[PDB]
Amino acid sequence: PQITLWKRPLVTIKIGGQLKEALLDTGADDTVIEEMSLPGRWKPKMIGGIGGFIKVRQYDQIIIEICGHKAIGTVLVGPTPVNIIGRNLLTQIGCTLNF
Amino acid sequence: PQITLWKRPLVTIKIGGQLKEALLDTGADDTVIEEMSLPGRWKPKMIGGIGGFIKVRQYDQIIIEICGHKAIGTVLVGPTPVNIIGRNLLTQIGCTLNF
Ligand SMILES: C[C@H]1CNC[C@H](CCc2c(F)cccc2NC(=O)CC(c2ccc(F)cc2)c2ccc(F)cc2)N1S(=O)(=O)c1ccccc1
Numbered sequence A, B: 001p002q003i004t005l006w007k008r009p010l011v012t013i014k015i016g017g018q019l020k021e022a023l024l025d026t027g028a029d030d031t032v033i034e035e036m037s038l039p040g041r042w043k044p045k046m047i048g049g050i051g052g053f054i055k056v057r058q059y060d061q062i063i064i065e066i067c068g069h070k071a072i073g074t075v076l077v078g079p080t081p082v083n084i085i086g087r088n089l090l091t092q093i094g095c096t097l098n099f
């Protein structure tokens, strides 16, 4: 699809068999989602935002569907204001910015 | 142009007669630039997200040039860790997400 930016680019994602809403964010290096249970071991990670840095849990090789497109990669879990799909997964689904 | 997301989508912008590097961020509602002087009236605003909130100065009707494309809109100025071109100005240059 072609998504304009007059409104927030919110799409449906599927992770752990559950549908959630997430923001497609070209300004985020990584994908970060609100608290939920993910399988496997996690590693520590710090991510920096507008207001400073936060600690998150890093899960690797997580299956996630984004607007119907399959991705498998790193998902961070932490106290984010909204679920965010960052460049690590936007590249997997072949997303580009065009003007 | 078509910009891939293998690395941060950093572009050169021209604002207040200064050349600056800024991130094209579909996850940002507003455009926020590091401390600089801008002409006209301003009002305080709080913007937030990962890490919490920061106080910024809101300047309206500011002209920006992004990749040769002129756009006018509100520009927030404050202690952001990176200059961000948010949706309020990405729409004006006809920027879309495509996959
Ligand atoms: C550097 C950029 C890159 N991601 C976007 C974000 C924009 C911040 C921003 C601006 F810059 C300029 C003007 C406004 C704002 N804020 C919003 O638009 C609010 C928004 C939001 C989005 C992501 C957040 F994390 C936090 C909040 C929001 C959407 C839906 C909702 F219901 C409630 C809030 N920042 S970040 O937090 O630092 C960050 C850095 C690394 C990874 C993730 C995020």
Ligand SMILES: [Cl-]
Pocket (backbone or CB within 6 Å): A072, A073, A074, A088, A089
């Ligand atoms: Cl990944």
Ligand SMILES: [Cl-]
Pocket (backbone or CB within 6 Å): B072, B073, B074, B088, B089
């Ligand atoms: Cl505006």
Ligand SMILES: [Cl-]
Pocket (backbone or CB within 6 Å): A004, B094
């Ligand atoms: Cl349009």
